[PDB]
Scaffold this active site. Structure first.
Site, PDB file in Angstrom:
ATOM      1  N   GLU A   1      45.259  29.586  19.876  1.00  0.00           N
ATOM      2  CA  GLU A   1      46.016  29.290  21.065  1.00  0.00           C
ATOM      3  C   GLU A   1      46.505  30.516  21.808  1.00  0.00           C
ATOM      4  OE1 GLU A   1      46.186  24.994  20.492  1.00  0.00           O
ATOM      5  OE2 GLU A   1      46.500  26.470  22.104  1.00  0.00           O
TER       6      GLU A   1
ATOM      7  N   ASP B   1      47.118  24.999  30.605  1.00  0.00           N
ATOM      8  CA  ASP B   1      46.204  24.958  29.489  1.00  0.00           C
ATOM      9  C   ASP B   1      44.774  24.649  29.963  1.00  0.00           C
ATOM     10  OD1 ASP B   1      46.969  21.751  27.739  1.00  0.00           O
ATOM     11  OD2 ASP B   1      45.909  22.184  29.564  1.00  0.00           O
TER      12      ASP B   1
ATOM     13  N   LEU C   1      52.690  22.290  24.557  1.00  0.00           N
ATOM     14  CA  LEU C   1      52.615  21.518  25.789  1.00  0.00           C
ATOM     15  C   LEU C   1      54.006  21.135  26.334  1.00  0.00           C
ATOM     16  CD1 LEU C   1      50.997  19.948  27.933  1.00  0.00           C
ATOM     17  CD2 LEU C   1      51.081  18.032  26.376  1.00  0.00           C
TER      18      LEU C   1
ATOM     19  N   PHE D   1      47.379  19.271  16.082  1.00  0.00           N
ATOM     20  CA  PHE D   1      48.222  20.086  16.905  1.00  0.00           C
ATOM     21  C   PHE D   1      47.659  20.133  18.328  1.00  0.00           C
ATOM     22  CE2 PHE D   1      51.113  23.780  17.310  1.00  0.00           C
ATOM     23  CZ  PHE D   1      50.556  24.426  18.416  1.00  0.00           C
TER      24      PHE D   1
ATOM     25  N   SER E   1      34.184  10.243  11.606  1.00  0.00           N
ATOM     26  CA  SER E   1      34.302  11.596  11.089  1.00  0.00           C
ATOM     27  C   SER E   1      35.268  11.648   9.905  1.00  0.00           C
ATOM     28  CB  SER E   1      34.814  12.567  12.131  1.00  0.00           C
ATOM     29  OG  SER E   1      33.915  12.710  13.190  1.00  0.00           O
TER      30      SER E   1
END
Length: 164
Positions: free
Chosen positions: A11, A20, A32, A104, A117
């Site tokens: 990040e 972002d 955020l 996250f 998945s």
């Protein structure tokens, strides 16, 4: 390497409000602020999060504090999530870091939607899960980061995070 160093790598660290990849107002280490288009709304959320009039800028410590809270919250969200918890419990320490990373970035809800998945990770079918994870908007929008995370799930090592 650990979850903190991993996420700091992905990040970055920014001390002034920024947009972002999705165009949303963010600050610090991927924190955020709001999905709203108003920069004013963003400054307001920022001041509320920090407890002071920031004028859109924070210190390193403040950035780190938000970061500590966000990682903690991601972990707790996984543990409270009926879809996520069993996967997490089944994983080794490295792979747990990978799942924390996804949560996250895209939230609990978002990750929990990766039904097929999740099932493959739980079954420890690494190669198959890596292929399925890549068939997503996530991988198409942020391919370098997604590849880093996917490699982590595939190998169970931190190889993708060498050049940090």
């Amino acid at each position: 390497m650990n979850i903190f160093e991993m996420l700091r790598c992905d990040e970055g660290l920014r001390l002034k409000i920024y947009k972002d990849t999705e165009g949303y107002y963010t600050i610090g280490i991927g924190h955020l602020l709001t999905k709203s288009p108003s920069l004013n709304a963003a400054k307001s959320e920022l001041d509320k999060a920090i407890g002071r009039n920031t004028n859109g800028v924070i210190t390193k410590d403040e950035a780190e504090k938000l970061f500590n809270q966000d990682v903690d919250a991601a972990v707790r969200g996984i543990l409270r999530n009926a879809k996520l918890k069993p996967v997490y419990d089944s994983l080794d320490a490295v792979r747990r870091a990978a799942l924390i990373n996804m949560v996250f970035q895209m939230g609990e809800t978002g990750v929990a939607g990766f039904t097929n998945s999740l099932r493959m990770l739980q079954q420890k079918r690494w190669d198959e899960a890596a292929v399925n994870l890549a068939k997503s908007r996530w991988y198409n929008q942020t391919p370098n980061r997604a590849k880093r995370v996917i490699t982590t799930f595939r190998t169970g090592t931190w190889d993708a995070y060498k050049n940090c």
